[PDB]
Design a protein around this ligand. Sequence first.
Ligand SMILES: NC(=O)OP(=O)(O)OC[C@H]1O[C@@H](n2cnc3c(N)ncnc32)[C@H](O)[C@@H]1O
Ligand SMILES: [Mg+2]
Length: 597
Amino acid sequence: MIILGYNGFSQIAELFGRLYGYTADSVDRHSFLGHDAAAALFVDGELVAAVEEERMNRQKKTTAFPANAMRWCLEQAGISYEDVDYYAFGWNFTAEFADAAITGLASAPIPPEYKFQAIGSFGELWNGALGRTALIEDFTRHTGYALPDEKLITVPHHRAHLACGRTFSGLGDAAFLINDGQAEADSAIMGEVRDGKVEVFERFTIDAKNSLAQLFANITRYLGFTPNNDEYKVMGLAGFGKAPDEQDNPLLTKVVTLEEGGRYSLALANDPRGPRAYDPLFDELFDGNDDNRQEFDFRVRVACAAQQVIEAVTAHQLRALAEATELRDLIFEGGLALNCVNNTKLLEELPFTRVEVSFGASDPGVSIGAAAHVAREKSVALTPTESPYLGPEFGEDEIRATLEEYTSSVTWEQLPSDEVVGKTAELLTGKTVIGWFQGRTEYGPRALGNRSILANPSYADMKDVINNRVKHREPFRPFAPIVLEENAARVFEMGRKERSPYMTFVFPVRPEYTEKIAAATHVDATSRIQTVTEDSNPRLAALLREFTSRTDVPCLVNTSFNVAGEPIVCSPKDAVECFLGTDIDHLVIGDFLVSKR
Ligand SMILES: NC(=O)OP(=O)(O)OC[C@H]1O[C@@H](n2cnc3c(N)ncnc32)[C@H](O)[C@@H]1O
Ligand SMILES: [Mg+2]
């Protein structure tokens, strides 16, 4: 039983650019489905391989067919397209949905002129990208394998999110919340998993016009940031501000309405100007004009408001789900689980003992999920696994061959394998920013110490220094720390958590370490931490013991290894080209210590 799950449409790029004006140069360029195209391959229940097409084609959140990733996934498992039993697509645009979607459109309080325009666009998206026919054509043009209808199973988007979380959570019977920007028809659902069987409580299912995630997205656009690429900047800005009273939160009274059964709805959900309608309504709530919106204290006030909406709405949803079932082990998946601040708050302030958000809570995870969903259904007992390190590895010979292609630009020494960790630790004792390239490429949006820039957080000026050594760093972004699992409770206020290996939860820094791990903390006194063990990342675990024995510092800064708007480096080619395009001191890539000439 070989099952491959994927996500992408080659024509989705073209169609949104034309129909909705969402073009490659627009701030709305990441705001259409198919973003975070990828492949994930299960052989006999072991998740053998996975990587996002953004890492291969080097184009961020690429909506493309994941051709290079599917190539690589098959190569890793040493098979071809024809050995795969079922392909899993992480969207389920069936005829039944399209039947309901038109029927829905027909039945709506709208001038029929807007109705023709909408139904016709949905047609262009249907025929162009979404439909089972477009899919089979799209696959067949790109792989060269002609995909038998038999071998293609489309998974409901939200169900694909669910399948990702279950694969990595460790749990059995669990409650769950999926809350993403938009699915086929829903924007969020809740239910439970009991003794293998998923059950959606349809009573909580929120429609796509009442989208909590896309409200935050509109807010991100409002403040001159890229919606669907820069929402953390809002979360980030909520750090420098005080939350209003919930009765004093303009967005929580004139935009969002809390309904019984943990439901909610939005003013201007049915306005046929689309979502851009909220732009002037936001000016009418926050003094907004053309010399105040992209300002700081403005950005901060809004941010706090938006962040509180997020905290407020999701809190309601989960309260409801509390009575709806007995279970207190929660799976939170979908893109609103990217709000790591909010994730901690749900855990601590609500009745769920355990809350598991995976490194694939976002759409990148729906490629893994799509495959997992089909497998479990095929009674294929799934080998439990916690590892995000699912992408391309590189040998000692492939790195040495790449560094020789750059003899003119960099020098390098090849250290003995088990001395590297200790030599990098000695460097890291200084005001030194490091490139760290080891093991298989990590999956999802956060770098978890295989394609990382590392640095010593103990020096007070290190924040300013990292941002200066790696020019081309994207602003409004705080630095996150790595720590060994054992030092987590000592250094951070963990509450109900004993470990956070994916940077999915934020935690307050205890006062006795605030000067020691400064660079890896926000002004909120918060760190989006990655716990590390000899089991999860032995080389990374080892680095920390060497670094900590020398400095008595328990944490290293771990920030994504990339320039602005470029995705995380995948190849060693990628790593060196980045190292040279930055003022980073050194690059430790496998057993090699690269320096510049
Ligand atoms: N399925 C689909 O359409 O893609 P998806 O599941 O990846 O959507 C993620 C959604 O979460 C929003 N989002 C991203 N980061 C966020 C954060 N920190 N807080 C709140 N919303 C966030 C983001 O703007 C987007 O609306
Ligand atoms: Mg999604």
